Structure formats: structure tokens, C-alpha cells
Structure 1
Amino acid sequence: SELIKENMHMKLYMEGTVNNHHFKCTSEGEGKPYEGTQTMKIKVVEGGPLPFAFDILATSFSKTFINHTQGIPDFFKQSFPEGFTWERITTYEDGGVLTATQDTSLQNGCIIYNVKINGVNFPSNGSVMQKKTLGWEANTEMLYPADGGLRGHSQMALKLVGGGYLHCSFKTTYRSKKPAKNLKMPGFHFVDHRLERIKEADKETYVEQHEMAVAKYCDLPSKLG
């Protein structure tokens, strides 16, 4: 994947609505695609300060930055120069849902993200609308081919002020802009993620996030096969 260098920059545009609060964000980032690490610096540029926890947006800000181990084919790095899209719905156990659609392209050496967010039904006294959340635990995504692309299933735990967790889960479809004939698809595998907030300011209108992500098989040996 020669177009994806050891170090890459990214730029992002996001617009969305959560319940009926409209906003726009931009971000600039850098990372090491083959090491599976990256940092994004994010600005809320319209609609700030947001009345909901920024944590619900965190997964919507970068699939080229996954260290693919154990010979697992890399759906995302193979997709350049054409790029790829993703689409996702996250459901929170207390009723809120966050839907996101995303385009990833490569333009003059910079990876470009365009994201649309539609979140609905977040409960008025829930931790998200009360801004009583404290970031995500690590998680393991489970992936396999489906629907002409790559399906992901994830489950994440959101830390709460006062202790304990709010659960969510999401279903993602990643779609390449290359035709299947020109891709080596992975089989069933996992991606371990640790998505962290490293800095913030001004009531979450400035946020820095770091992610480490590694594609791998399960640690445990198989009796069969």
C-alpha cells in the first residue's frame, strides 16, 4: 500500500444533529498507519458548546491506522487510492442512538474524512445529556466479510461520574471503493482498540483523542482444524 506512508496526516469535516442540536466539527490529525496509532485534534466550530457528552462522538472521528498482524489482509490500506466508506449505528442501553456515515479519501497525500452524524432519543436525565461521562474503556471489535464489504460488531463501556458504566453496542459496515475482484479480503478476525481522550478545553469544544488499534486472531488455540 505505497500511498500509505509510515507517517500520515488527516483532515476531517463533520456535521450533525444530536436530538435536535445541530453542530459542526473539524479536525487535523497525524498517525503511524502500520503501528496502529494516531492523534486527532478536534474543534467544535458550530453549535458549541454541545449540550451532550462529547464521548458519544469519539468513534466517529479512522480505519487506515490499524496495525494488521498475523498476516490478516488490510481492507482499508488496500482500498487506496480510491478509498472507502463506513456506516454505523450505536445503540445505548438507556435509549439513545447515534448513527454515523463516513467517507474516507486521499487527496494530495492527506487522508480526508467527511462525516455525517444523526443521534436521537438521548434521555434527558441520562449521563450523556447530563454530561456525566468519563471516557471509554478498551474494547475488542469482531469482524468478518458481509454485505459486499466488511462487517464489524462492537460493544463498549462508557465510564460514569460516580462509578459504573453505560453500555452501548454498534454494528458497522465498511465498504471499499475498489471492486471485490481487486481486493484480498480478510476472514473472521478481531481488532483490539483503546480510544482515549488526552486533552480537552472550553467545555469540550476542543478535544484531542488518541487511538491504538491492532487486528489479530483470538489468543486461544483451537482443538479443531
Structure 2
Amino acid sequence: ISDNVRIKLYMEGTVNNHHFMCEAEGEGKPYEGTQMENIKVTKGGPLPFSFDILTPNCSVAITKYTSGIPDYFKQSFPEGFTWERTTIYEDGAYLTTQQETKLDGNCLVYNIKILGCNFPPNGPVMQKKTQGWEPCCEMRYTRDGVLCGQTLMALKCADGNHLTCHLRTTYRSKKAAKALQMPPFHFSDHRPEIVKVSENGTLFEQHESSVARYCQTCPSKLGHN
């Protein structure tokens, strides 16, 4: 994959019985870990819920992998990969995702399927009273030949409070595991941001910065990474 790539995204889902579709065009810098997308709600807009719950579903090939840690995602191309996940919100809501990532020439294509349920109608998400995500840190480890990840995230609320959730993910390379160099346990910092909302809340300018690393703030007395 090159240093610069364009992004094409297609999304479809149903949350609390509300069907919607999204489409996006953007660009990314795979080795710099930076991405930008202009995401449009093509159907079912304006959504009866905060767009924030959709953001984290829109990036794992665009991450700056440091310290010589093998890159499970960039190694997967041209074949590409898929990933599956369930996000559990502290107030009882569940959002499950299935995504396919492929590289068509120099354009990264994301195909997303979503099913969400039990979001409280008076909660901050359904009342559209959230104000974006705080940055987060994902824990990544191998299991059964695939790469897994778990993340704790926190949504900023109008009240000043934070609505927390838990993501449990399984990343699946379309390439036979044997043809890959599996990584050791590591982390990935992520900072999702929505810097612009327009067209009556149906078009969002979203950005992302992410870096894969080891724990670099706390030295190891046993000589481990």
C-alpha cells in the first residue's frame, strides 16, 4: 500500500429499529496513521441518534505501526481483511459490526454492516446529547491464529459526564495466517474527531490519528517490551 490513498466507504445498519445508510469519500496516509472522511447519511437522515456511535466503525490499515511491531493489516494486502465487533455500552445498549476492507488499485474500500439495539430513548445517544469521543487505547493480542482487540471508550456528554463502552474485536486477514508475521501483544492509541457537521446534520467531516506501540512510559525491570 502507498503513502497516500483515497477512501471509499459504504455503510448500512439498523439501530433501535431505525434503518439508515451512509457513504463516504476521503483520503489517508497509511504510514502516518492519519485519515479524513466526509461521511454522508444517504438514507434515514437526519438520524434519530448521535452520529458519534457510528464514528468508531469508520480504520485499522491507517495506523502508524512503530517499534518494529509487525503490521497485521498492511501485511494483508492486496487480499485485504475483514473485522467483526460488538460494542457494549454501560447503559445496556449493544452495537454489533461486520466490516470488509479491500484495496482497489489505490483506493481503500470499506463495506460496513451494523445492528444496534436497546439504546435507552432517554439516554445521551438517542437524545443526541453526546459531543464526540475521547481518545482511546486498544489492547491487541493474538488468539487462534487471528488478531484480537479490546477497547474501552468514553463518549463526552452535554452534562460533562462520560458514557463508557467496551469494544471486543476480532480482525481476520483474508490471507492465510501462515503467510503472515503475527505480532506480539501491543497497544494502539486512537483519536477520533468530527470537525464539521453540515447539510442539516447529514454530512460529517471526520478525522482519525492512530499509533501502534508498546508501553513506553513505564520501564520494565525484567527487560520486557
Q: Percent identity?
A: 62
3-state SS in 2 of match to 1:218: coil
Q: Give the structure 1 partner of residue 219 of structure 2.
A: 221
Q: Give the structure 2 partner of residue 125 of structure 1.
A: 122
Q: Measure the CA separation in 2 of the matches of 1:86 and 1:204.
A: 28
Counterpart amino acid of 1:157? A
Q: Measure the CA separation in 1 of the matches of 2:104 and 2:50.
A: 32
Q: Give the structure 2 partner of residue 5 of structure 1.
A: 2
Counterpart amino acid of 2:10? Y
Deviations 1:155-190 (A, max 9, x none): 011000021110001101000011011101111000
1:61 paired to 2:37: no
Q: 1:200 aligns with which of 197, 211, 215?
A: 197
1:79 paired to 2:76: yes
Q: How does 1:32-51 map to 2 (within 5 A)?
A: 32-51=29-48
Q: Measure the CA separation in 2 of the matches of 1:199 and 1:96.
A: 26
1:16 paired to 2:17: no
1:197, distance to aligned residue in structure 2 (A)? 0.7
Q: 2:165 aligns with which of 164, 168, 178?
A: 168
8 Å CA contact retained: 1:86, 1:102: yes
3-state SS in 1 of match to 2:53: helix
Two-structure CA RMSD over aligned residues (Å): 0.9
1:159 paired to 2:156: yes
1:191 paired to 2:180: no
Q: Measure the CA separation in 2 of the matches of 1:190 and 1:158.
A: 20
Q: Measure the CA separation in 1 of the matches of 2:200 and 2:159.
A: 20
Q: 2:144 aligns with which of 130, 147, 160?
A: 147
3-state SS in 2 of match to 1:124: coil
8 Å CA contact retained: 2:87, 2:95: yes
3-state SS in 2 of match to 1:184: coil
Q: Aligned residue pairs: how many?
A: 222
Deviations 1:15-64 (A, max 9, x none): 10001000000001101110000101100001111001100001111111
8 Å CA contact retained: 1:148, 1:175: no
Counterpart amino acid of 1:145? T
Q: Measure the CA separation in 1 of the matches of 2:143 and 2:9.
A: 27
8 Å CA contact retained: 1:67, 1:215: yes
**Structure 1 unmatched ranges of 5 or more:** none
3-state SS in 2 of match to 1:76: helix
Q: Measure the CA separation in 2 of the matches of 1:34 and 1:70.
A: 13
Counterpart amino acid of 2:99? Q
3-state SS in 2 of match to 1:215: strand
8 Å CA contact retained: 2:2, 2:106: no
3-state SS in 2 of match to 1:197: strand
**Structure 2 unmatched ranges of 5 or more:** none
1:25 paired to 2:6: no
3-state SS in 2 of match to 1:103: strand
1:203, distance to aligned residue in structure 2 (A)? 4.0
1:224, distance to aligned residue in structure 2 (A)? 1.8
Q: Measure the CA separation in 2 of the matches of 1:147 and 1:201.
A: 44
